[PDB]
């Protein structure tokens, strides 16, 4: 019987329960975006703005239902409309992480027919982050 | 006239006003669980999640009555259903404290007829805790 | 034209706008308590509990009017009922400050006919307090 | 395509999107105040009181609309009524920044016919401020 640790074991939505994505695995996800005609986009946030919080609810009456701060991140340039080249997306990941080496960075893609984000996963976390576990240390 | 100190004098419910439990005293409490047929279970929490607090009430209307965060701790494995062996409980205390050496750890027992926790006391506090007094420094 | 400083210029109610009380000045205030038949008492608080705050209002509906945390301090022993000797009060100030050398300590007096505190002033602040000005540095 | 940075890029209302004002540029703004017959005034605030916040809203019902802490700063002396000399304003800037070298200081001017502040801009920020970007580092 192994025990799932509650300590410093924060997650990051899709794919965060798998082993960290290799460069080949990321490339494959990017091919999937392009093959489906979705719109790639990068978003980023400093460590203090990375996880959902409640601080703005201090200003509210009884209307906090499904309100959370830090759902929005900051857009890196613009969504890559008309992009049909996976290398272009990989180059923007490099450019974004270079400009913001200490930020959380996530890759997302949009479907404009449904008007919804259709994919998303973390591609960088700050090296100073101490609030997460490697796969083999998630249970003890 | 001695003065009960308000400074760094936090307590931990049942038995926290007595001298710290010896290993023999813990064993005796464990025998009491087994003799009564109750279900032993261990729970633990990191220092930041150990004491009752109010942070979630920021999301509330006028409904904070008997709401507190940090009442729930994290379960170590499962409650030990059918356990009639005190040595088994002692071995789980050892295993739990070893896996989480910096956590607060409490031993509890359940009665399934009343469906309520029927006993509970702290069995470990982190070595770095500075918010509590030894028995002879509780008053000055 | 001198400018009253807003920075690190916290005050402590009665007499805090005067030069700090000498031992002779404190003795005189104590004589005043005794001459009037009032009940002397000492109260103390650690630095974090010294000034009025709002943290408990997170639990409230619209009822925060004239609610503040940290108005209560901690009683030193009991109010000195029947005390008609100023030296006894001075000895308790010494004893209280010795047991809590890093606390704020105030002397108060009660009138039991009106049932209200009738006098009060600070008799010790922690040496580590940096949030207050000397009389000659209160304006610049 | 350059990306506007969200990190440590706080601004300070009027003129904060231009290059920092030179002494000659400040003098020109001051001439503008005097030429129009407006009332010059200086205000200042320590770093913790410089930007708009919400802390007092913890005491509120549903009435936080257009309530913010830290809109008021501290007045330096009095508004300079009748002042028709730009050198006088410049001398008060010097005197204010000297007395409060670690404070944010802003120059404002009042129109008493409209009864409203008619101009305002930052004239000093603390040297220890790390929450702002130079013009050439505002986008990456």
- C-alpha triplet B91, B92, B94: angle, nearest 5°: 65
- Terminal alpha carbon distance of chain D: 9
Residue at token pair 């460590």: A47
Determine the Cα–Cα distance for residues C105 and C75; give it in Å rounded to an integer. 10
Q: What are the strands of the beta sheet with B116-124, ordered from one edge?
A: B74-76, B39-45, B104-111, B116-124
Which residues of D are less than 8 Å from A59 in CB distance? 54, 57, 64
Q: How far apart are CA D98 and CA D100, in angstroms?
A: 5
Contacts 24+ apart (CB under 8 A), A34-37: A34/A83, A34/A84, A34/A85, A34/A86, A34/A89, A36/A118
Q: At what angle do helices A86-99 and A23-35 cross, to 10 degrees?
A: 130
Those residues whose C-beta lies under 8 Å from the C-beta of residue B44, and which sit 6 or more positions away, are B73, B74, B76, B96, B100, B103, B104, B105, B106
| Residue B70 CB partners (closer than 8 Å, separation 6+) | B45, B49, B50, B51, B52, B53
Q: What's the full length of chain C, in residues?
A: 140
Exposure letters C68-103 (e unless 16+ CB within 10 A, then b): eeeeebbebeebbeebeebeebbebbebbbebbeeb
Closest chain B residue to A3, measured at CA: B77
Cβ atoms C89, C108 nearer than 8 A:
no
Q: What is the resolution of this structure in A?
A: 2.3
Strands C116-124, C104-111: pairing kind: antiparallel
Which residues in chain A touch residue B74, judged by CB atoms under 8 angstroms apart?
Answer: 6
Give the chains touching C; criterion: ≥3 Cβ pairs < 8 Å: B, D
Place of tokens 């509780």: B138
CA distance D73 to chain C (A): 10
Distance from CA of B78 to the nearest CA of A (A): 9
For residues B4 and D11, what is the distance between their CA atoms, to the nearest angstrom? 51
Distances (CA, A) of B87 to A1, B81, B83, B91, B99: 18, 15, 10, 6, 18
**Beta carbons within 10 angstroms of residue B41's beta carbon:** 23
Question: Distance of CA A106 to CAs A20, A60, A111, A140, D89, Å?
Answer: 13, 30, 17, 29, 51
Category of A73 on φ-ψ map: left (φ > 0), alpha (ψ -120 to 50) or beta: beta
CB-based burial, D8-20: b 16+ in 10 Å, e otherwise: eeeebeebeeeee
CB A20 within 8 A of CB A138: no
The residues near D110 (Cβ < 8 Å, ≥ 6 apart) are D38, D39, D41, D79, D116, D117, D118
DSSP string, D77-125: S---TT---HHHHHHHHHHHHHH-TTSEEEEEEEETTTTEEEEEEEEE-
Q: Identify which of C13, C41, C50, C32 has the alpha carbon closest to the alpha carbon of residue C108.
A: C41
How far is D121 from D28, CA to CA, in rounded Å? 13
Give SS3 for B20.
Answer: coil
Method: X-ray
**Is A107 within 8 Å of A34 (Cβ atoms)?**
no
CB C121 within 8 A of CB C14: yes
Residue B30, class by beta-carbon neighbours within 10 Å (0-12 exposed, 13-18 middle, 19+ buried)?
A: buried
DSSP state of C13: S
Q: Do B57 and C61 touch (CB under 8 A)?
A: no
Place of tokens 């009017």: C65
Domains of chain B: total: 1
| Chain A nearest C-alpha distance from B38 (Å) | 22
Chain B: closest CA distance from residue C3 (Å): 38
Nearest alpha-carbon partner for C42 in C81, C77, C69: C77
Q: What 3-state class would DSSP assign to B16?
A: coil
Q: Which of D5, D6, D53 is best to mutate for the A interface (most A CBs within 10 A)?
A: D6
Nearest to A59 among D3, D6, D57 (CB): D57
Q: Angle, to 10 degrees, between the axis of helix C23-35 and the axis of helix C86-99?
A: 130
Tell if the CB–CB gap between C46 and B3 is shorter than 8 Å.
Answer: no
Contact B3 C77 (CB under 8 A): yes
Task: Provide the CB-side half-sphere exposure for B19 (13 A, CA).
Answer: 5
- Give B-chain residues touching C49 at CB under 8 angstroms: 6
Q: Which residues of A touch B58 (CB under 8 A)?
A: 54-55, 57-58, 64
Residues of A in contact with B77 (CB under 8 A): 1, 3
D104: left (phi over 0), alpha (psi -120 to 50) or beta: beta
Which spans in B44-134 are helix H?
A: 86-99
Closest CA to C89 of C28, C18, C16, C20: C28
Query: Which CATH number belongs to the domain containing residue D97 in this structure?
Result: 3.30.190.10
Encoded tokens for C119: 């006098």
Find the domain containing D101 and state its range.
1-140
Q: At what angle do helices D86-99 and D23-35 cross, to 10 degrees?
A: 130
Between chains, do C61 and B62 touch, taking CB under 8 Å as contact? yes
Pairing verdict, β B39-45 and B74-76: antiparallel
**Measured in whole angstroms, how far is the alpha carbon of residue B91 from the centre of its chain?**
17
What gap in Å lies between CA B107 and CA B112, rounded to an integer? 17
Three-class secondary structure of residue B3 per DSSP: coil
Give how far D131 is from chain A: nearest CA, Å.
Answer: 13
Residue A106, H or E segment: strand A104-111
Q: Is-contact B20 B133, C-beta < 8 A? A: no
HSE value, Cβ hemisphere, 13 Å, CA-based, for A138: 11
CA distance B10 to B16: 9
Q: Which two three-digit tokens encode residue D83?
A: 């002042």
Contact C74, C45 (CB under 8 A): yes
Nearest chain C residue to D45 by CA: give it.
Answer: C6
Give the three-state DSSP class for B99: helix
Residue D43 CA to its chain's centroid (Å): 7
Of D3, D58, D64, the CB nearest to A77: D3
Chain A residues with CB inside 8 Å of D54's CB? 56, 58-59
Which residue shows structure tokens 């220890």?
A: D128
Q: Are the beta carbons of B42 and B76 closer than 8 angstroms?
A: yes
SS3 B56: helix
CA B122 to CA B50: how far, in whole Å? 11
Give yes or no for a contact between D118 and D111, defined as CB atoms under 8 angstroms apart: yes
- Counting as contact any 3 or more CB pairs under 8 A, the partners of D are A, C
Q: Which strands make up the sheet holding A104-111, listed edge to edge?
A: A74-76, A39-45, A104-111, A116-124
Handedness of CA D45, D47, D53, D59 (dihedral sign): negative
Q: Considering CB atoms only, which of D58, D74, D100 is closest to C57?
A: D58
What's the CA gap between C28 and D66, in Å, rounded? Answer: 51
User: Rounded to an integer, what distance in angstroms lies between the CA atom of residue D67 and that of residue C54?
Assistant: 17
Minimal Cβ distance to B74: which of A1, A6, A57 = A6
In sequence order, the 6+-apart residues with CB closer than 8 A to the CB of C115 are: none
Sign of CA dihedral A36, A39, A44, A48: negative
């Amino acid at each position: 019987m192994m025990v799932w640790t509650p300590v410093n074991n924060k997650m990051f939505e899709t794919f965060s329960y798998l082993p960290p994505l290799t460069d080949e695995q990321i490339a494959a996800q990017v091919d999937y975006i392009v093959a489906n005609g979705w719109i790639p986009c990068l978003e980023f946030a400093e460590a203090d703005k990375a996880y959902v919080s409640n601080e703005s609810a201090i200003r509210f009456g009884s209307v906090s239902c499904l309100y959370y701060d830090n759902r929005y991140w900051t857009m890196w340039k613009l969504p890559m409309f008309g992009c049909r080249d996976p290398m272009q997306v990989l180059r923007e990941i490099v450019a974004c992480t270079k400009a913001f080496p200490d930020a959380y960075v996530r890759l997302v893609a949009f479907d404009n027919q449904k008007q919804v984000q259709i994919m998303g996963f973390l591609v960088q976390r700050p090296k100073s982050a101490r609030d997460w576990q490697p796969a083999n240390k998630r249970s003890v």
